[PDB]
Design a protein around this ligand. Structure first.
Ligand code: HEM
Ligand code: HEM
Ligand code: HEM
Ligand code: HEM
Ligand SMILES: C[C@@]1(c2ccc(F)cc2F)OC(=O)N(Nc2ccccc2)C1=O
Ligand code: FES
Lengths: 241, 75, 49, 60, 49, 64, 378, 54, 54
C-alpha cells in the first residue's frame, strides 16, 4: 500500500497526432475479448453492428453474433425464449448482477471494459503494463493468494489472476500468439471500444489544421487591410501663433 | 449611448490618411516587426517574469520534497 | 464494526474534555463490541476509508 | 500584358452579384478538391484501415 | 499659411505599383483591388466549407 | 515470447544493475531478523521503473 | 436618412455594433467580451443538441451520454465541443476579469458588478452541467459543493436537504440540475445584455486609462474584423481540444459510472475551480473554509473600493504591475495546490498562497498605488 | 424531425428540448412586439387618434 | 424524464408523490388553455378595432 509506480510510454501505431488505429490489430484484439475476457468482463456498450465498419464484414459479424444465445422478449404465452443472435444485440454479459460477479471472483468485482482505457490514467499503457507486468512478490510482502501480485495495480494486490501467458485463439491471418502480442492486440481493441470516433476525429483534425493554415493568414490579411488606414495615419498639430 | 459629433471639443489637429487599396497590409513586417516585439519584451520582462520563476522554484522544490517525503530509510 | 477489547479499552481512555464534539464512548454504543455508524464524513459528505 | 488580378477584378469582382457567384462556384469546386486531397494525405499516413478489406470481401 | 500644409511622404507604406508620382494609378487599380478582393473571396470560400 | 528477449537485454543496462543490487541488499536485510516491518516494495518498484522504460523503446519492433 | 439609423430594431444593432464610438487603441485583451458571447452561443447550440438525446434519470444518464458518443451521428463532436467550450468559457472569463483588474475597467461600477453576477451565474451553470453525465466525479463533485451550504449556522442542513430533495444527492437532485442548467444560460444571456447596456453609457476603457473621446473610431469595420479574427483563434483553440486532446482536461473517474458508496482516493475539480478549492481546504475549520472560498470570488466586488491610485490603468505603474503578476502567479500556485493531495509541503504552501492572495488584494496593491502617488508628488 | 421511421424515442426527447427553449424565444419576440407598439402607443375603441386625451 | 419507458410514469410521480405536483401539473395544463383563450380574445380585438394597421 501507499507507494505507487506509474506506466511507461509504449509507441502504439495510434499514438501520434494524425495516427489512426491498426484495424488488423483491432481484429485480433476482439478475438482476445471473445476468447479470454468475456467470461469475466462485461462490455455493455459495444454491439455486433459496431464491428462492421471497423474489423469485420457485415456477413462475418452476423456469423459472430450467431455463435451466442441472447434471450428475446415474449411471444403470445408471455414466455421469454432464447434466440440464435443477430447484430442489434449487445456483447453478451457474463453475470446478471454485480453481486454474482463478486461471488465468482472471491469478493472482487471485475469492472466493465467498454470505457476502461479512458477510465484509467495512462490509458492503454496502464492496461499493457498490468497484463505484461505480473511478477513474484518481494520479501516483506505476503498476500491472501486469493489476491495476486501486480506492481502496476494501486496497493499491489490485484484480485485478477494473470489471464495472459495462456497461449490461446484462432488466428486466421495466423500471427504468433505470445503474451506480449496478445496484450498489444487487446489494448489496441480496448482503445477502439473506448473511442470508436478516434479515426474520424483525426481525419477532421488534419482538415481543421489545413483550413486554419489557410484561413488564419487570410483573415489576418483582411484585418490588416482595413486597419492600414489607421496604422499609417499622420497627425499634425497646428495651433494659432 | 455616445455618438460622433457629441463626444468632445478638438481644435487644430490635422490627420492625413491613405486608402487601404493604395498601401501595404504588412509594411516592413519582419524588418520593423521583430525589433518592436524585442523592445516590448525588454520593457515588461522585469515586471512579468519574476513572479512566474518564483512559482516555478516553489513548484520544483514542492514536487521534489513530497516525492522524497514518501520514503523511509530506518525502522 | 465488531470491536476488539484493545479498541474498547482505548476509547474509554480518551479525554472527553479535549475533543471537538464531546462524547464518552459509553453514551454512543448500546453494547460496547458493536459500533454502528452512518458512513458519511461531517465535513463535506465523502465516504471515509 | 494586363495582369490576371486585373482580369479577375474586371470580369468577376466588380459586381457583388458575380463576386458572390464566384465564391459559390468556388466553394463547390473547392469542397471536392480539398476533401479529395485531405483524404489522400490521411490515407498515405495510415494504411491499416480498410486497405485490408480485399482479404474478407469478394469471397462472399 | 494653410498653403504650408504639404501631405507627408507615404512611400514607406505604398504598394509598389503606386510609388511613381509620374505614373497614373488607374493603370494598377484593377490589379490592386483584384488582389485584396481575391483575399476576401478565398476567405469566404474557406469559411463556407 | 519476445518480452523475455527484451527484459534480459534491459537488465544489461547500467541503471537496472544498481537497482537490482539495491533490491538484493534489501532481500538480504529482511531475511536477517525475526520481527521486521520493512517491505522491499520500494526497491522493486525502483527497478521495474528503469526496466520497463527501456522495454517500451524496443519491444514493438518485434510484435507483428 | 438611413434605414440602419432610425428603424427601431436596427437602431439597437447600429448603436452596439456599427456606429459605436470605440477607442482607436484597444488591444487583444478587449477581444474577450465578444469571445465570451461566442462561448455562450456555442454552449447554447451544442447544449440544445445534447438535450435532444440526454435523459436525466440515474438509471439512464450515463448510458444516454454514451449513446450520444457512439450512436448519434456526430454526437461525439457536439459532446466534446460542449465539454471543452465550458473550459474555453472559463479561459475567456479569467482573461476578461484580469484585463478589468489591470486596466482599472472596474471603475465602471455597474458594468463590473454585473460581471461578478455573470461570473457567479456561469460557475453555478457549469457545476450543474458537470453533474449531468453521472460519472464518479459528477457525483462526488455534486456531494462536496452541495455540502458547502451545510456550514451555514442554524439553517444549513435544511437548505442542503431542500436542494437535494432527499437525504443525499439522488434521483431528485439530477433532474433538478438538468432543469436549472437548461434555464440559467438564458438568464445569463439577459444579464449579458444588461452588462452591455451599462457599458454603452461610457464606452470602453483603453490600455492607457486616459479618456479616448479625442480619438474614437467606428466599431465597424475595425472591431468587426478584429472580433472575427479573435473568433477564429477561439475556434482553433477549441478544435485543438476536441479533435486532438478531448480527454486532456477531463477526469478519467468520470468515465466510471457514479458510485454512491465509494469515493475516489484523489477527488479534484476541473482546472478552473482549483484556486478556490485550494483556498477552502487551507482552513482547518468547516465554516472558516467555505467563508474563505465564498470571499475568494466575492472579493471582486470590493476591488473598486480599494482603488487608491490617481491613474486608472496599471500601464504607467511599475510597482502595481509587479504585484499584479505576483497575483497571477499566486493563482497559478493555488491551481497547482488544488490539484494535489492534502499532504506535507502542499498544506503549508497552500496556506501561504491563500494568505498572499488576500494580502495582495486587500493590503499590498492599495499600498503600491499610494506609494506610486507619493512618488509622482500627487 | 422523427429521428427515425415513426414518432419514437428520438422524437420525445427532441420535443422536450424544443419545448424548453421556445418560450424563452417567445419572451424575446414579445419584447420586440412591445418595442414596435411603443412607436405608436395603443389604438382605442373609437379608432380615432387619442393624443388629445392620454 | 423524457424517455418512452418513463415519461408517463414521471408525470404520474408528479401527481401522487411530489408535494403539490398535482396543482403545478394542472396549473400548467390549464394555463396552456388560458394562454389560447387570451390569444384568441387578443387577435379578435385586433381584427375588430383595426389594430392590425400597426
Ligand atoms: C484479458 C487479457 C483481460 C483483460 C484485458 C483484463 C483487464 C482488466 C483490467 C484493466 C482490470 C482493472 C484493474 C483496475 O481496477 O485498475 C481488471 C480487473 C479484474 N479482472 Fe480482468 N481482464 C482480463 C481477463 C480477465 C479474466 C479471464 C479474469 C478471470 C481469471 C479476470 C478477472 C478480473 C478481476 C477479478 C478483476 C478485479 C481486480 C480487483 O480490483 O481486485 N479478468 N481486468
Ligand atoms: C457572461 C460573460 C461575460 C460577457 C458575455 C461579457 C461581455 C462583455 C463585452 C462584450 C465587453 C466589451 C468588449 C470588451 O471589453 O471585452 C465587456 C466589457 C467589460 N466587462 Fe464583461 N462580460 C462577461 C463577463 C464579465 C466579468 C466576469 C466581468 C468582471 C467581474 C466583466 C466586467 C467587464 C468590464 C469592467 C468591462 C469594461 C472593459 C473596458 O472597457 O475596459 N465582464 N463585457
Ligand atoms: C441552455 C444551453 C445549455 C443546454 C441546453 C445544456 C445542456 C447540457 C446537457 C444535456 C448536458 C449533459 C450531456 C453531457 O454531459 O455531455 C450538459 C453538460 C455540460 N454542460 Fe451544458 N448546456 C447548456 C449550456 C451550458 C453552459 C453555458 C455551460 C457553462 C459553460 C455548460 C457546461 C456544461 C458542462 C461542463 C457539462 C458536462 C460535460 C461533460 O463533461 O460531459 N453548459 N449540458
Ligand atoms: C405571446 C402572446 C402575445 C403577447 C405577450 C402580447 C403582448 C401584447 C401587449 C402587452 C399589448 C398591449 C396591451 C394590449 O393592447 O393588449 C399588445 C398589443 C397588440 N398585440 Fe399583442 N401579444 C401577443 C400576441 C399577439 C397576437 C397573436 C397578435 C395578433 C396577430 C397581437 C397583435 C397585437 C396588436 C396589433 C396590438 C395593438 C393593439 C392595440 O393597441 O389596439 N399580439 N400585445
Ligand atoms: C465542474 C465543477 C465546478 C464548476 C464550477 C464551479 F464554480 C464549481 C465546481 F465544482 O463541478 C464539479 O462537480 N466539479 N468537481 C469537483 C468539485 C468539488 C470537489 C471535487 C470535484 C467541478 O470542478
Ligand atoms: S474531510 Fe472533507 S469531506 Fe471528509
Amino acid at each position: 500500500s501507499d507507494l505507487e509506480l506509474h506506466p511507461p510510454s509504449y509507441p502504439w501505431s495510434h499514438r501520434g497526432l494524425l495516427s489512426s488505429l491498426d484495424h488488423t490489430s483491432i481484429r485480433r484484439g476482439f478475438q482476445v475479448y471473445k476468447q479470454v475476457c468475456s467470461s469475466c468482463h462485461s462490455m455493455d456498450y459495444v454491439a455486433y453492428r459496431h464491428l462492421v465498419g471497423v474489423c469485420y464484414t457485415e456477413d462475418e459479424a452476423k456469423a459472430l453474433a450467431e455463435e451466442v444465445e441472447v434471450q428475446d422478449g415474449p411471444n403470445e404465452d408471455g414466455e421469454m425464449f432464447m434466440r440464435p443472435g443477430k447484430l442489434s444485440d449487445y456483447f453478451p454479459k457474463p453475470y446478471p448482477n454485480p453481486e454474482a460477479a463478486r461471488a465468482a471472483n472471491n469478493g472482487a468485482l471485475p469492472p466493465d471494459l467498454s470505457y476502461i482505457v479512458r477510465a484509467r490514467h495512462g490509458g492503454e499503457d496502464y492496461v499493457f503494463s498490468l497484463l505484461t507486468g505480473y511478477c513474484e512478490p518481494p520479501t516483506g510482502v505476503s498476500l491472501r493468494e486469493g489476491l495476486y501480485f501486480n506492481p502496476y495495480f494501486p496497493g499491489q494486490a490485484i484480485g485478477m489472476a494473470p489471464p495472459i501467458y495462456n497461449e490461446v485463439l484462432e488466428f486466421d491471418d495466423g500471427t504468433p500468439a505470445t503474451m506480449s502480442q496478445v496484450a498489444k492486440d487487446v489494448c489496441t481493441f480496448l482503445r477502439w471500444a473506448a473511442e470508436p470516433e478516434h479515426d474520424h476525429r483525426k481525419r477532421m483534425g488534419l482538415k481543421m489544421l489545413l483550413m486554419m493554415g489557410l484561413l488564419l493568414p487570410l483573415v489576418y490579411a483582411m484585418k490588416r487591410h482595413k486597419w492600414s488606414v489607421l496604422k499609417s495615419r499622420k497627425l499634425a498639430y497646428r495651433p494659432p501663433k | 449611448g455616445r455618438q460622433f459629433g457629441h463626444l468632445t471639443r478638438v481644435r487644430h489637429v490635422i490627420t492625413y490618411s491613405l486608402s487601404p487599396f493604395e498601401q501595404r497590409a504588412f509594411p516592413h513586417y519582419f524588418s520593423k516587426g521583430i525589433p518592436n516585439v524585442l523592445r516590448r519584451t525588454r520593457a515588461c520582462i522585469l515586471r512579468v517574469a519574476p513572479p512566474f520563476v518564483a512559482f516555478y522554484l516553489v513548484y520544483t522544490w514542492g514536487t521534489q520534497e513530497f516525492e522524497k517525503s514518501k520514503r523511509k530509510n530506518p525502522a | 464494526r465488531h470491536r476488539t477489547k484493545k479498541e474498547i479499552d482505548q476509547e474509554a481512555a480518551v479525554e472527553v474534555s479535549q475533543l471537538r464534539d464531546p462524547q464518552h464512548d459509553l453514551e454512543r454504543v448500546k453494547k460496547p463490541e458493536w459500533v454502528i455508524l452512518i458512513g458519511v464524513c461531517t465535513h463535506l459528505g465523502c465516504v471515509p476509508i | 500584358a494586363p495582369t490576371l488580378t486585373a482580369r479577375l477584378y474586371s470580369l468577376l469582382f466588380r459586381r457583388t452579384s458575380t463576386f458572390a457567384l464566384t465564391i459559390v462556384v468556388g466553394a463547390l469546386f473547392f469542397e471536392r478538391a480539398f476533401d479529395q486531397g485531405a483524404d489522400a494525405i490521411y490515407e498515405h499516413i495510415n494504411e491499416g484501415k480498410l486497405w485490408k478489406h480485399i482479404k474478407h470481401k469478394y469471397e462472399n | 499659411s494653410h498653403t504650408d500644409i504639404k501631405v507627408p511622404d507615404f512611400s514607406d507604406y505604398r504598394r509598389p505599383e503606386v510609388l511613381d508620382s509620374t505614373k497614373s494609378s488607374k493603370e494598377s487599380s484593377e490589379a490592386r483591388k483584384g488582389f485584396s478582393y481575391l483575399v476576401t473571396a478565398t476567405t469566404t470560400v474557406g469559411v463556407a466549407y | 515470447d519476445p518480452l523475455t528477449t527484451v527484459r534480459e537485454q534491459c537488465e544489461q543496462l547500467e541503471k537496472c544493475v544498481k537497482a537490482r543490487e539495491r533490491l538484493e541488499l534489501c532481500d538480504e536485510r529482511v531475511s536477517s531478523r525475526s520481527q521486521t516491518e520493512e517491505d522491499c516494495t520500494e526497491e522493486l518498484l525502483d527497478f521495474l521503473h528503469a526496466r520497463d522504460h527501456c522495454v517500451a523503446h524496443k519491444l514493438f519492433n518485434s510484435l507483428k | 436618412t438611413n434605414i440602419r439609423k432610425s428603424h427601431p430594431l436596427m437602431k439597437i444593432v447600429n448603436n452596439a455594433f456599427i456606429d459605436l464610438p470605440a477607442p482607436s487603441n484597444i488591444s487583444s485583451w478587449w477581444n474577450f467580451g465578444s469571445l465570451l458571447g461566442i462561448c455562450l452561443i456555442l454552449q447554447i447550440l451544442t447544449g440544445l443538441f445534447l438535450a435532444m438525446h440526454y435523459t436525466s434519470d440515474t438509471t439512464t444518464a450515463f448510458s444516454s451520454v454514451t449513446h450520444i458518443c457512439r450512436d448519434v451521428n456526430y454526437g461525439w463532436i457536439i459532446r466534446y465541443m460542449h465539454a471543452n467550450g465550458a473550459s474555453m468559457f472559463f479561459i475567456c472569463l479569467y482573461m476578461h476579469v484580469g484585463r478589468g483588474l489591470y486596466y482599472g475597467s472596474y471603475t465602471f461600477l455597474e458594468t463590473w458588478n454585473i460581471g461578478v453576477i455573470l461570473l457567479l451565474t456561469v460557475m453555478a451553470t457549469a457545476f450543474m452541467g458537470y453533474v449531468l453525465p453521472w460519472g464518479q466525479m459528477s457525483f462526488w463533485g455534486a456531494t462536496v459543493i452541495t455540502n458547502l451550504l451545510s456550514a451555514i449556522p442554524y439553517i444549513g442542513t435544511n437548505l442542503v436537504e431542500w436542494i437535494w430533495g432527499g437525504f443525499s444527492v439522488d434521483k431528485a437532485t439530477l433532474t433538478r440540475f438538468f432543469a436549472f442548467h437548461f434555464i440559467l444560460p438564458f438568464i445569463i444571456m439577459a444579464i449579458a445584455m444588461v452588462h452591455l447596456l451599462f457599458l454603452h453609457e461610457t464606452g470602453s476603457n483603453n490600455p492607457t486609462g486616459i479618456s479616448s473621446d479625442v480619438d474614437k473610431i467606428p466599431f465597424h469595420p475595425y472591431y468587426t474584423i478584429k472580433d472575427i479574427l479573435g473568433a477564429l483563434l477561439l475556434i482553433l483553440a477549441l478544435m485543438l481540444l476536441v479533435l486532438f486532446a478531448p480527454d486532456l482536461l477531463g477526469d478519467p473517474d468520470n468515465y466510471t459510472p457514479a458510485n454512491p458508496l465509494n469515493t475516489p482516493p484523489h477527488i479534484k475539480p476541473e482546472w478552473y475551480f482549483l484556486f478556490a478549492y485550494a483556498i477552502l481546504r487551507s482552513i482547518p475549520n468547516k465554516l472558516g473554509g467555505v467563508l474563505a472560498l465564498a470571499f475568494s470570488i466575492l472579493i471582486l466586488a470590493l476591488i473598486p473600493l480599494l482603488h487608491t491610485s490617481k491613474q486608472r490603468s496599471m500601464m504607467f505603474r511599475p510597482l502595481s504591475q509587479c504585484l499584479f503578476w505576483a497575483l497571477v502567479a499566486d493563482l497559478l500556485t493555488l491551481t497547482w495546490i488544488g490539484g494535489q493531495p492534502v499532504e506535507h509541503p502542499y498544506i503549508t504552501i497552500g496556506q501561504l498562497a491563500s494568505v498572499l492572495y488576500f494580502l495582495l488584494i486587500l493590503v499590498l496593491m492599495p499600498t503600491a498605488g499610494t506609494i506610486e502617488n507619493k512618488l509622482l508628488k500627487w
